[PDB]
């Protein structure tokens, strides 16, 4: 329960083992072949996974949360951030940029 260097390390090992081995979709952006191309994990996790294959959820929710977090704990909740408003003090965000064609 308590946050220690060791508990953190063990959590990360489980998360990354799932991430590396168990994301079992067939999406190009989710794939290990796509990831192998990028050096800065944030460009994958916080940028390319913003895209949406089904046009309802992004891939961080539809795939990462399913095969990693949910696999660790089924009760681990993640909201759909694309259902949020276009918020008043934010630049307009054209949603089409996330909607993967075909």
């Amino acid at each position: 329960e308590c946050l220690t260097r060791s508990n953190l390390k063990k959590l990360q090992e489980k998360i990354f083992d799932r991430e590396l081995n168990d994301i079992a979709c067939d999406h190009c952006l989710c794939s290990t072949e796509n990831r192998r191309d990028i050096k800065y994990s944030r460009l994958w996790f916080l940028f390319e996974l913003e895209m949406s294959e089904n046009w309802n959820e992004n891939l961080r929710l539809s795939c990462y949360n399913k095969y990693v977090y949910s696999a660790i704990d089924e009760s681990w909740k993640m909201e759909n951030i694309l259902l949020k408003e276009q918020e008043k003090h934010y630049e307009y965000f054209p949603i089409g940029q996330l909607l993967i064609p075909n």
């Binding site: 959590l11 190009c28 952006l29 460009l43 916080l46 940028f47 951030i81 408003e85 934010y90």
Partner: protein, 369 residues
């Protein structure tokens, strides 16, 4: 044991970064499922800064593009600060785009970065650590918005009661990143508002050209390195520094370097420079950055590639994006030593249109979309 929490309300997930203060984790609010970022700092650190940062963030709260603090406090052997989950930094996206940004993207970024710095200054703070790494895009529908982070070196430049500007002082140590540090910072002069803007200027030039002239200088020690970067900065004219760029960049740098120590910047003049440049280049306000179009083109191409079945692979995607969005992608040319006109820059539109593409079959599929 796999359920690690901070502030009793947030659950720690995937590590997403690692700074000199400590590490950064993706997290989620346990009740709402809202995504957050959790920064952890060991209390064993010799230069603790998270407590200070959390107070500066809270003080600045409500400004556009200022991350909202959800929580700060001790958890075990760490201090933890929970904020809005943000996307990649501009340095990250710079790498994504293979370390050149178009003029349209540089202008889009400049305008937002101006507003952030203007806001911070209006709250009596200077940032003092301006660099691409400390500006991050949001996620979700906040993804068009530049945010500013890392207030560890920030300080107030004026007294609350009197609004008296901090006194001019010397012998001050260079505390930020050397690559973007203002000249006066190298000279050990107290930083003020002018220095945030000068550093921002260096960042914008860096985005355009891929590098700054004082990168790659070699030295035996750290102080030697800082001094050599200093001497390079002292001896490169604004003309030389901004060669090959629209004159607006040179005008920006000359203005910022000319500011007196306690002088209030004319932020509107600086913004107008780039807004006007954008109008002259006929860039539409469509919120499409380079990476917006590169990511979209890549996803679309790779999916078609999969149905059909590096730097070279990236370059092919970039070529396709530039053909699809020919008026968006105009770049600095290393050969240019003059300052190009808007019509001259817009020649690249025609180039982008007629750029030959390598893969016949895949293109036929992209066309048939």
């Amino acid at each position: 044991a796999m359920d690690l929490r901070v502030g009793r309300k947030f659950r720690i997930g995937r590590k997403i970064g690692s700074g000199s203060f400590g590490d950064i984790y993706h997290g989620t609010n346990l009740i709402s499922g809202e995504e957050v970022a959790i920064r952890l700092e060991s209390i064993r650190s010799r230069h603790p800064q998270l407590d200070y940062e959390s107070r500066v963030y809270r003080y600045l709260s409500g400004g556009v593009g200022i991350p909202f603090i959800r929580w700060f406090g001790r958890e075990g052997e760490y201090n933890a600060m929970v904020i809005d989950l943000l996307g990649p930094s501009l340095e990250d996206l710079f790498n994504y785009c293979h370390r050149r940004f178009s003029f349209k993207t540089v202008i889009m970024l400049a305008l937002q970065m101006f507003c952030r710095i203007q806001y911070i200054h209006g709250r009596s703070f200077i940032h003092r650590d301006i660099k691409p790494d400390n500006f991050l895009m949001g996620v979700g529908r906040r993804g068009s918005t530049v945010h500013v982070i890392d207030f560890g070196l920030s300080k107030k430049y004026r007294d609350f009661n009197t609004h008296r500007h901090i006194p001019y002082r010397e012998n001050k140590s260079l505390t930020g990143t050397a690559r973007y540090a203002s000249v006066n910072t190298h000279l050990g002069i107290e930083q003020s508002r002018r220095d945030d803007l000068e550093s921002l200027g260096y960042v914008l030039i860096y985005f355009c050209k891929g590098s700054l002239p004082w990168q790659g200088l070699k030295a035996t020690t750290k102080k030697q390195k800082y001094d050599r970067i200093m001497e390079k900065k002292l001896n490169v004219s604004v003309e030389t520094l901004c060669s090959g760029l629209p004159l607006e960049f040179q005008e920006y740098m000359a203005y910022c370097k000319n500011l007196k120590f306690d002088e209030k910047p004319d932020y509107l003049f600086l913004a107008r420079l780039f807004k006007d440049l954008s109008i002259k280049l006929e860039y539409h306000n469509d919120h499409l950055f380079d990476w917006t179009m590169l990511r979209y083109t890549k996803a679309m191409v790779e999916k078609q590639r999969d149905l059909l079945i590096k730097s070279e692979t990236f370059n092919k995607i970039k070529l396709l994006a530039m053909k699809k969005f020919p008026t968006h992608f105009h770049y600095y040319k290393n050969e240019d030593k003059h300052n190009p006109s808007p019509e001259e820059i817009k020649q690249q539109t025609i180039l982008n249109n007629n750029a030959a593409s390598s893969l016949p079959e895949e293109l036929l599929n992209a066309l048939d979309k």
